[PDB]
Design a protein around this ligand. Sequence first.
Ligand SMILES: O=c1ccn([C@H]2C[C@H](O)[C@@H](COP(=O)(O)NP(=O)(O)OP(=O)(O)O)O2)c(=O)[nH]1
Ligand SMILES: [Cl-]
Ligand SMILES: [Cl-]
Ligand SMILES: [Cl-]
Ligand SMILES: [Cl-]
Ligand SMILES: [Cl-]
Ligand SMILES: [Mg+2]
Ligand SMILES: [Mg+2]
Ligand code: NA
Ligand code: NA
Length: 326
Amino acid sequence: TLNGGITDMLTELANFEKNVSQAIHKYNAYRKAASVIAKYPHKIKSGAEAKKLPGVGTKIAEKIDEFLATGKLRKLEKIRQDDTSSSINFLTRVSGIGPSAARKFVDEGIKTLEDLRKNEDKLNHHQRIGLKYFGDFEKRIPREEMLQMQDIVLNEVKKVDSEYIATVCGSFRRGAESSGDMDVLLTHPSFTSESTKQPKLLHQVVEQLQKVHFITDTLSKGETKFMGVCQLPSKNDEKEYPHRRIDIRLIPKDQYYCGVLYFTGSDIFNKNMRAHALEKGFTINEYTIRPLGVTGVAGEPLPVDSEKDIFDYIQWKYREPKDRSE
DNA sequence: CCGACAGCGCATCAGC
DNA sequence: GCTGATGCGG
DNA sequence: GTCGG
Ligand SMILES: O=c1ccn([C@H]2C[C@H](O)[C@@H](COP(=O)(O)NP(=O)(O)OP(=O)(O)O)O2)c(=O)[nH]1
Ligand SMILES: [Cl-]
Ligand SMILES: [Cl-]
Ligand SMILES: [Cl-]
Ligand SMILES: [Cl-]
Ligand SMILES: [Cl-]
Ligand SMILES: [Mg+2]
Ligand SMILES: [Mg+2]
Ligand code: NA
Ligand code: NA
């Protein structure tokens, strides 16, 4: 974190374009610049120095010079003062409320935590739970708690069927000392790219986890993806653990590597890798890596038997999960 | 300049 | 009821 | 907002 001041600035600028301006490309431009600068092993001394890095252009370089000289950015100082922008940025922090709903509520005058609570009636199910656990979802999860959660998930899944294989991905698999949430990749021999010999595969698991009171709420749920809430059990007289966000993805067993690659992230890593893939003439999703014909249309899935095989197709040396945190 | 910028599952809605 | 588009995950 | 062709 040699350039934390600069990266935080780029991140605030990113959120602004995302939440207020609804300009996703500017959002990603800022995030890319922040990321590349985050792994830069030197304390940046000038906008020009930073401009040498890919993803950092003239505009961002000018802002870096402003930030390095004054220790702040006028554009942000003004944005921070703007009531609408402020309110819109804040509301988007509730899970379920994005830029559109945020601006929408702000129009109606609903712009504070208090306002949301006195208007639950104006929230869909997901946004309702997000408000309920607003404080909790703001908290980080120490890796030690992730370990306890991992144990519960793997053992409970094993109890449903010994053939299930639950792998904890996301930032956890990347070695992080704390996570924003828990992401679980699920596989079972009965569900392959070729067939679904068994129904309720994901349901059974969700059900069992709810049975033992690990999963407390549901944000969204389908046959292959579950997005909800969970909580570690506390001992007698012991304060309860904060509620945690949990995501579970059931992927075809034979497409495991593409699935684990995707779910391990990071999101920026995935976007960079998938983009590189396109330039190399391939397309990558959580199921497969396919070549791109002359027309540009995806071809048939190429054989994959490891994460490395995917890296090899696009001519990228293998990168351990811990080195994919972009 | 100008087009590209990753990919997709679930919830919700408009139009039929 | 469906399909298609959009918001959200994030 | 940044980049490549
Ligand atoms: O936009 C996205 C979001 C997530 N993902 C993938 C990569 C990411 O590592 C994984 C889990 O998503 P999270 O939003 O949970 N992110 P991550 O676990 O990396 O970080 P955090 O610690 O915040 O949960 O899903 C994408 O491909 N694109
Ligand atoms: Cl944009
Ligand atoms: Cl994105
Ligand atoms: Cl600032
Ligand atoms: Cl695979
Ligand atoms: Cl596919
Ligand atoms: Mg995560
Ligand atoms: Mg997640
Ligand atoms: Na640059
Ligand atoms: Na939100």
